[PDB]
Design a protein around this ligand. Sequence first.
Ligand SMILES: Nc1nc2c(ncn2[C@@H]2O[C@H](COP(=O)(O)OP(=O)(O)OP(=O)(O)O)[C@@H](O)[C@H]2O)c(=O)[nH]1
Ligand SMILES: Nc1nc2c(ncn2[C@@H]2O[C@H](COP(=O)(O)OP(=O)(O)OP(=O)(O)O)[C@@H](O)[C@H]2O)c(=O)[nH]1
Ligand SMILES: Nc1nc2c(ncn2[C@@H]2O[C@H](COP(=O)(O)OP(=O)(O)O)[C@@H](O)[C@H]2O)c(=O)[nH]1
Ligand SMILES: [Mg+2]
Ligand SMILES: [Mg+2]
Lengths: 195, 18, 19, 44, 430, 430, 431, 48
Amino acid sequence: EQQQAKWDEVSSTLAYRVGRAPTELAMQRGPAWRTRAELTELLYRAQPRDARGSNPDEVWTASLRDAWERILPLGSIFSGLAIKIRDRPGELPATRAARVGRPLDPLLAPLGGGGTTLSPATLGHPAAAAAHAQHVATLAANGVMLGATTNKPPLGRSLSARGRAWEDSEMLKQRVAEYGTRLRALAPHDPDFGA
Amino acid sequence: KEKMMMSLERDKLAARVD
Amino acid sequence: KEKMMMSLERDKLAARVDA
Amino acid sequence: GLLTPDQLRSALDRLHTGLDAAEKDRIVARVKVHYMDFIRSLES
Amino acid sequence: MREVISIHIGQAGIQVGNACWELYCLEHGIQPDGQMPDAFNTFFSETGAGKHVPRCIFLDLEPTVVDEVRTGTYRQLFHPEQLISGKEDAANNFARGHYTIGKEIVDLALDRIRKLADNCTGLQGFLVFNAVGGGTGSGLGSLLLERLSVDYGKKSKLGFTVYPSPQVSTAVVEPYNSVLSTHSLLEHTDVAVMLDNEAIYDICRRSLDIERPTYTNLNRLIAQVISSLTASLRFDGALNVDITEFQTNLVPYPRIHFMLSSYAPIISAEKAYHEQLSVAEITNAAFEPASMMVKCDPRHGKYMACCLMYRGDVVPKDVNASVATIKTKRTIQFVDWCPTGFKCGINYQPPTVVPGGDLAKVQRAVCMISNSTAIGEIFSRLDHKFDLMYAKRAFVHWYVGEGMEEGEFSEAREDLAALEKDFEEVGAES
Amino acid sequence: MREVISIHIGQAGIQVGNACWELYCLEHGIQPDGQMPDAFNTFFSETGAGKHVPRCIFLDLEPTVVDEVRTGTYRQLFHPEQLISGKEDAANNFARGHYTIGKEIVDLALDRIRKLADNCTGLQGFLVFNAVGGGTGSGLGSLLLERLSVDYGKKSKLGFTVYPSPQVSTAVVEPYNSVLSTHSLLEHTDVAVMLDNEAIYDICRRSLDIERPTYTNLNRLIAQVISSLTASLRFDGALNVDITEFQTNLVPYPRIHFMLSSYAPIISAEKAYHEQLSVAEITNAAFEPASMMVKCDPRHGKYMACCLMYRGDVVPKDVNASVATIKTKRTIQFVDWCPTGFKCGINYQPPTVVPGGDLAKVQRAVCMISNSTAIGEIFSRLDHKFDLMYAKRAFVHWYVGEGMEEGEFSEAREDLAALEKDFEEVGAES
Amino acid sequence: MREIVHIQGGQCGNQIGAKFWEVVSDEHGIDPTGTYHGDSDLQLERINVYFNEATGGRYVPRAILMDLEPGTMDSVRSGPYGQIFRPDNFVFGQTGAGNNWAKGHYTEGAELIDSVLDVVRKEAESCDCLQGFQVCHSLGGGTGSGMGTLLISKIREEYPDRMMLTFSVVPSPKVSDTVVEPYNATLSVHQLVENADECMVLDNEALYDICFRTLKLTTPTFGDLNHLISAVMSGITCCLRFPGQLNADLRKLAVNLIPFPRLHFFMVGFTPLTSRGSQQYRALTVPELTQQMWDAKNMMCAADPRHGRYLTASALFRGRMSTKEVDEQMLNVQNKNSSYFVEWIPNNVKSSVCDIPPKGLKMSATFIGNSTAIQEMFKRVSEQFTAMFRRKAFLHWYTGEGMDEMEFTEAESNMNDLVSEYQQYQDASAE
Amino acid sequence: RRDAMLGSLLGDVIGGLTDPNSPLAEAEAALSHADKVRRKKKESLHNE
Ligand SMILES: Nc1nc2c(ncn2[C@@H]2O[C@H](COP(=O)(O)OP(=O)(O)OP(=O)(O)O)[C@@H](O)[C@H]2O)c(=O)[nH]1
Ligand SMILES: Nc1nc2c(ncn2[C@@H]2O[C@H](COP(=O)(O)OP(=O)(O)OP(=O)(O)O)[C@@H](O)[C@H]2O)c(=O)[nH]1
Ligand SMILES: Nc1nc2c(ncn2[C@@H]2O[C@H](COP(=O)(O)OP(=O)(O)O)[C@@H](O)[C@H]2O)c(=O)[nH]1
Ligand SMILES: [Mg+2]
Ligand SMILES: [Mg+2]
């Protein structure tokens, strides 16, 4: 808690020094990278066989028996080394199956607990993206021009603020939609980490 | 419109056979 | 397809009328 | 574009005519020699 | 096994790759026929009976630079299906490369990326070569890197982007295609190394003592940088420094991942014999602002994290003694929160020299990839360049008619301010 | 001794069989004269002092194409009266080939089959070659299949017949002749292999890079399919397939025996060296929809039974590996009651190339022949062609006059419609 | 895989196109008969851009000759390099417009446009994918002006995704060939401003100035004017037909030179022009080429570049040249006179390098300049128009073809919209 | 299912041709207004 108070005061001083919101700061992008890592790992372990890889040796020699291991040789046959690749499809590894979020850091309170969401509707940052879409639709309907003057520099909001981060991509949206059923087979429920 | 008239003629002829 | 199938049905049933 | 008969034979071999030696000799003999008239003779 | 896949996008991507793949052939002895007369397994894949093919795809909408390779001296090296071509170019239009024309060819691009990834055992990363100031190099590269992040997770992306210079550039619409590409190269690329055109012209003019060099001489010593940063996988050395070391040591915050590049010994044949290639000399010369491949003044900013890639007969002590003098010098300023700034990789092979090349055969070399806050000054040059052109909305209807809405410029410019406000956030002392 | 009588009917069968028997001379080294300068006994009959005559008849009502073989490059190969000609052709008329001008020549043709059957020690099967779009292939083909079923009971028949295409056909009354040939194609042919004309136009255009192909180019790789089918009888291999092996491994039902065909490695002369041919790589191309010999969409149906023939240096490991990938590809769908789905026959003879042929020298090959429910789409569009033609009794006075009744159109359509009912219900989920 | 459709309208278009087609064919190696005689294979790699395959290796051009008189059809056919054209593309009339814009567009235009648009459509579908459309015509005639700009209008709706490039001459103030030159020019510009996506502008008196000053010809013949225009049009498409260090097709030139779709008019110039007596004294180096390129005397328009501020510029360089001496000259020419360049467009100059120089010169350069000096040229045509229009002289010859004076007033007004737009962006400033 | 899709798509296609609330009708109104104002501007310019 000494370090948490120190981090809060460093974030506040940095935010006032540079001119942006504390959640907008670059120091607080840890959970975004964490949920990005979780989405990538769940996607890789929940891809079909052909999206994972159509290697004729790999698929066949992994599926030769109930055990899934492939021997990758290294070096000559005289002094040879073996890589024992174990990869069971449709299941995350025991040391990798974890969906981690933080319910105690207050900067993720609008997100309701920064965590991994596998539904396409709540994928990424939906509320800020909807607010920005409403704002740009209202500005377009009002007919105002925004880049008219060079004397006014734009305010520096982040991709997570505009809903244009990596997680909010339409291409993850369609990929999760098309792999959604086996994604829910691997991961049963997306938890709401707020409470 | 051609199908319905021909179907009416078909089962009319079936009843005629009966 | 349906129209031609029932047309052939009509023709073969009209063969029954001739006898 | 003047060609020699052995060059024409090797050109037919590269073009994969499928002919043997006797028929290649007859085809190159029915036309140094230019190449466009050889094209015309085979073309018509 | 260590195995990389390189992607070359746009007319700058192939022409750098033409100079790149000239060098990797000589490093492993691969002939242009494709036949060697175990270390080659990274950039080459053995095929059938003694034939090695590159692990690369040359994709460009314009067919002019692609079929030049097909009719060039390397017509047997590359797989013909790897060289992906198109009918018409993006024609210096980011909207054409990302919405209209780039949708049809990106499906065929991922069909061979999937084929290349399946054949090789262990991927180590991605090496993208493109120019963000063009149409295909930015627009089609924005779509391609967007595929690779959403499909190939946890595998690092090494970005080598040719970037516009404020002093001179060779297109009117350089501000638009570079600003619009900034969103793609922020979220998707894990490691982005910048390159600038006429900053490396001054390398040839001053160091190589050549007054009128061209793109061919420009890209050869780009390949010196590319080969030196990847040389640790191919050949054994004192400190084996792999691809994943770059992502874990050169970026503290996940969106400020922009780094510089500098090759220390850049000397001609006749200057090589007089000058003594000391390790303390080349390390001092590498950290000199003149030797950077992008226009930055490191005196203006502070170093964030530095990676040093040594080659040749470098003992592990002279690397330590030279870099200890680097920290003592006042003109090299490091950021306050990073006391441990250097990453040293020592390899055991001198750099190869191509026949006819400008560079001489040197015993030792240094390729430094360094993160600095002076890199934000490059984007400030493009900032006022974009806003002055966007004020009157010139050259906009080309982008609007090719699928894009007029609003896309607004969040693209305002995304660039997020990059600028990040650099002078991390540069602020606490 | 494994040995097959092949019969060719109609103008399509002769030109297909001309390129078929051109190929068969090359595997066994037979000269065009007929003299060799124990594998040859399957197709060629040893006669006296080093003379090998084919086990074939060329029956056709039109003498304009039989004499071209008689005056062509292969005059001395054939027996003088195995090639059976006639006075007048059927000229797109099933009535002519079946009732009026077929009766005189069918008795002469059946006399040659009895003498060919006496020469052969153990007869293995018959292969027919005809076009259902023409009069002779439909009419004379139907009567011979009617007669040979009665005289030679329980003997295997493999039907290699050419169907009209939905887009391209060379006459007007193909739909009439095709549906009449269908009534004898079901009951009297134990296996029918689907073949189409302009499906091979797409194969020659996109794979062989031939912009303007003719019928001669089509018949050479139709010959490559049938030669790969019968290659297991002639040559020793790791896993052998017989003519009777196909039937009890591919057709589950008496009324379902139509099946597709695909020959996977198709490369022109100049594309041979740069391409890499792996066992699973070509097998991926075998199941591609564009690489099929007919215009079916296998995604619409389900692969209900399948078979594979391999030639050349293919290990039995890689066939078991490549089948495993195809089974778990989502694009290719199997019927639910067929857990195992394949037959794998590996021959140790690489495919021979015709001198001057379009195909290049390939080490390994696939002859994928599979039974699917998507073949009902071929019978559907062809039936619609007959549907929109028979509606107002067009081109019927020809068929009524010389022998056929009106009521046999009713039986042919009803038998075809019952076949469509069977293809839909067998592929239905249980 | 990129094709350019060439169409020649009028006596001016046919004479320029005949001189042009003998240059590009000599560059690619096509002889007058039509076969190939090139020494290198680089000339053979890209022939489909300007030619079509034929039986026996003949290379018929993608050219369509149209005119309302048969007189100039015999001249292009009987001239050298005139047998190469297809006889089917030689569409012609018999009446002749007689330098009347209404006759070439309303009365006898419609009986010839339906014929030629069938000829254009059959060759447009023959190629795999078009790159743009190229037209050579005039603004003073009736057979190339009224009929030529009608086809430019008609081809626009049929192919709106393709580029329009017009190489059209304008009436000159100092030298006049026809009494009704401004009437045809005012109405041709109104058609050209909305339909054509790019407009390369030429004029006779500036070509006569270049043939007299830079070439020192005491008697510049009528064909020597067309040779300079011929050298330009090969230089614009120099990158489609050959490889290069920096590539720039027609659309890349379009996106770099057109900031707003109405400002598509360009002033053009061909760089290495020197008299034969002064040939051996000149240094053919890229610092020396750039000095001639930006000179006012080398411009092929009546526009003075000193008067008008340059909006955007394009330089298509040909030859084995170092890439820094390409663009360090472009940076130097911007900074030496910053008052002659637009401030609100940074990097006004576009550069492109091709590695195949034209025949006879080891280096070459073609300059395309989008400047607000070109609105000065339209002022004189507007000045000669309203001198004639307020008295309605020579107007009953135009109203007899069904064309009302309603079209005359709006055609003048859109030219006034063009010069008002160029003047407005000229006085435009930052912030 | 095929008949329901059939009825929906014929309904949309045929009703868009005559419906005053159709996007086709909206486009026709916009283009008619454009042509009318263009002709009126041309006539007024000539009169002036
Ligand atoms: N370092 C380096 N940069 C190059 C080279 N060639 C071109 N460039 C850069 O690329 C720009 C030229 O446009 P490109 O980005 O290559 O065009 P493109 O990627 O093909 O996009 P499109 O032309 O629209 O298809 C120039 O401004 C250069 O900065 C080269 O050989 N070396
Ligand atoms: N694939 C292929 N099809 C052929 C060939 N020759 C003919 N055909 C097809 O045969 C159809 C016409 O029937 P044919 O077999 O030629 O003639 P026919 O059945 O013998 O009838 P007649 O000529 O009157 O005796 C055409 O539609 C062609 O598609 C061939 O050599 N190869
Ligand atoms: N530069 C150049 N100008 C030409 C040429 N031929 C005609 N002109 C110009 O075209 C103008 C007359 O156009 P005209 O021939 O009557 O057009 P047409 O009626 O459509 O044939 C004159 O002012 C000439 O200067 C030529 O070959 N070169
Ligand atoms: Mg390009
Ligand atoms: Mg016949």
